[PDB]
Amino acid sequence: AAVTVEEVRKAQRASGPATVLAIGTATPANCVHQADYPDYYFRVTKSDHLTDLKEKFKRMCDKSMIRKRYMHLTEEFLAENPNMCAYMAPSLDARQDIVVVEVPKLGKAAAQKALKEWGQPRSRITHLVFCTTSGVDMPGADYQLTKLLGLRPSVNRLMMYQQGSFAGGTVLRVAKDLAENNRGARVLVVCSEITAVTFRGPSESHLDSLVGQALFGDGAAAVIVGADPDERAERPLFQLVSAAQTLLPDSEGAIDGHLREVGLTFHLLKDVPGLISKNIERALEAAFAPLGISDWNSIFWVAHPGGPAILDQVEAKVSLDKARMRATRHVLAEYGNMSSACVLFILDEMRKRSAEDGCATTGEGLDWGVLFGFGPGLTVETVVLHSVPI
Amino acid sequence: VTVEEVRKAQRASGPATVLAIGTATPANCVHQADYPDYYFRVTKSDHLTDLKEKFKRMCDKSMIRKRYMHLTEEFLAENPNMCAYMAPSLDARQDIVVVEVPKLGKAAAQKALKEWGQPRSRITHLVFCTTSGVDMPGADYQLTKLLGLRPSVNRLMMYQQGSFAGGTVLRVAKDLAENNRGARVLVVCSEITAVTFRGPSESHLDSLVGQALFGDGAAAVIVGADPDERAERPLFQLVSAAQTLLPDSEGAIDGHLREVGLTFHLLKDVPGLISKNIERALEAAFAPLGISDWNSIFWVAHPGGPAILDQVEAKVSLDKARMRATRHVLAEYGNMSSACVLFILDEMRKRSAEDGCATTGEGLDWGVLFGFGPGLTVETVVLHSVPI
């Protein structure tokens, strides 16, 4: 009645670009070393008699380029739940009972670290973006995390369920609009993935699911995003310049994922590394041409480590310097494939190594960077990042 | 090129505007007057006469005249596990909704896109919201294919949201259309009850009441900033958007996706809790605008149930005409979860047209859209009508 909508819009809106104010990561305590996983996995699933199948899983884990992973699932638990140890056995209820609890709990550990580095009180958080691919529930994990952290009972929550490995970029793309369109907004972004929904025994008939057993790991990464940082009170890490999403052509059913009574099952049709390599440059050009940037070796890289073959085939297609994917490959080695949370681990790794290596910026000395998310549909999320002087 | 130069050229200017609304439902229509007989027949529960009497009272007090349901008596005959109260059936239910949910959303999206009149290539964002099943790639991907939208459309997949997500999608579309020059957000809420349909159980009347209220439907809305005065005709403006959790409302509405499907659980007094807090939500949204006469703003309230509307309307002594659109959608469609408030929007502007009302908001200037759902979550969207 007093103010007009244009006056509200003018007042409501923020200035400046969405900025990463803090990054925090967390994993389950239980740590499984990749060198020992073929024996561990084949023992807990009672499959040591399938010798030829175990030999293939050994080479699978050898090619994985993963040194270790963290998993909430323990041998003691798995001994009590043979329905989650067989390849195809009704067990979704058992799996949901775990993830609907542990996924929010692990996200709290990651967000607690991000908030402590942030230094501001939780009460300043105005937006919560929670993303997971491990189970669904109502109220969602976003509700669980809010209660666990004690966030304001008016936080604008966004719950990303069953998204897939590309959601790491989707959450940044979402946070970018939330922080930039609302003046004092402070967005807590949380990705949390626990493999208890996809863990299952081996089968010589469904080898695509076997690679998942060699790559998927548990973990959560939290990020605090906001525009117009408070100087001397907040420490800008990266800037979210732009975000785009796209579907690669001829990639229709490349990676399918179905939530059934046997839990979450993944199905691999078509060459995923090849499909990404053939089109990565086109994604790079769409995001950096209006920027006047052509040298793909002049920008710091953040790529979802879906598998070592994806990294190799993209690094070879565009002739990347082997230092550009150093942070990406490092996270894959110490954590495995953690689905959406992976790209947020690499961000934390890149900035951590940069400050420890005396780089000029948080982006390995470079100014501009690119963040790639890869997942079902052959969806590619592309986020143009910018570093901050160190 | 510096980041600041990007930000200035990349963000939109005016307020987020609803440019079109389209709705769609399954063909099969089921009349509330016959549902007690039908429901207890297909579920083979006619031996529970005392229960059938309770259900009949549920349906008669529901203020629902008819509902649309993809589930047919023929299909239910071939799937007795979905007619039982608790029997393994998630695979069967998923097989339906992963296919029909995007398809029903396509029917509504076609309508909306037609009224919009612009080429489908101009759609830059897609927000897909459903509580009926999950899949990878999600329903957003299937709809992108079905509609022929551009690859590179920015998709947001809202799975397993609940009955408050009608407001959620608007909140999302608002920030998307306002921060990005040229963005045109296609918003689709699509719900199908084949994931919650189940037989009756004397020990769980709360699940039984869901069987009397929930219905199928999809609604599409096209949201954009800075409309084209020539090619585009605005319908509503999204001024603000806010979500909040209601105190002492823990466990009021729970929903679990299990091997027997999606089961709903009811604790506490949902209408009493929403009525007890509705005035705080109004004041929080409208006090900074100088508004305090709830009778002089149009209303779009999620019709989670008749009691909710009655008790909210009684709390603020609402002019009974303020809920006519909400209650009509409830009567003619039932509780379609997230899509409800969008159906109500469409019925508001349409009734506003054939009535000779000065605005799309029943002649009024400012309005409120409420979404109610699990966590006792309340979404509050402040709207502004458009002159007719």
Residue numbers in the entry:
A (entry chain B): 6 to 395
B (entry chain A): 8 to 395
What does the article say, verbatim?
The C170S mutant PvCHS was generated to investigate its potential impact on the local conformation and confirm the catalytic role. The asymmetric unit contained two mutant PvCHS molecules, as observed in the wild-type PvCHS. The overall RMSD between the mutant C170S and the WT PvCHS was small, with 0.26 Å. Importantly, the catalytic triad remained stable with a distance of 4.49 Å (3.2 Å in wild type) between the Ser-170 hydroxyl group and Asn-342 carboxamide and 5.57 Å (vs. 3.2 Å) between the serine hydroxyl and the Asn-342 carboxamide. Nε2 of His-309 was 3.84 Å (vs. 3.2 Å). The noticeable changes in distances are associated with the shorter sidechain group of serine than the oxidized cysteine.
Chalcone synthase (CHS) and chalcone isomerase (CHI) catalyze the first two committed steps of the flavonoid pathway that plays a pivotal role in the growth and reproduction of land plants, including UV protection, pigmentation, symbiotic nitrogen fixation, and pathogen resistance. Based on the obtained X-ray crystal structures of CHS, CHI, and chalcone isomerase-like protein (CHIL) from the same monocotyledon, Panicum virgatum, along with the results of the steady-state kinetics, spectroscopic/thermodynamic analyses, intermolecular interactions, and their effect on each catalytic step are proposed. The production of these value-added products also offers the prospect of increasing the value of the crop, especially because many of these compounds are soluble and readily extracted. This study characterized the enzymes involved in the first two committed steps of the flavonoid pathway, CHS and CHI, and the non-catalytic protein CHIL. Through crystal structure, molecular docking, mutagenesis, kinetic analyses, ITC, and FRET analysis, our study provides evidence supporting a revised catalytic reaction mechanism for monocot CHS and CHI and identified an intermolecular interaction of CHS with both CHI and CHIL in a non-competitive manner.
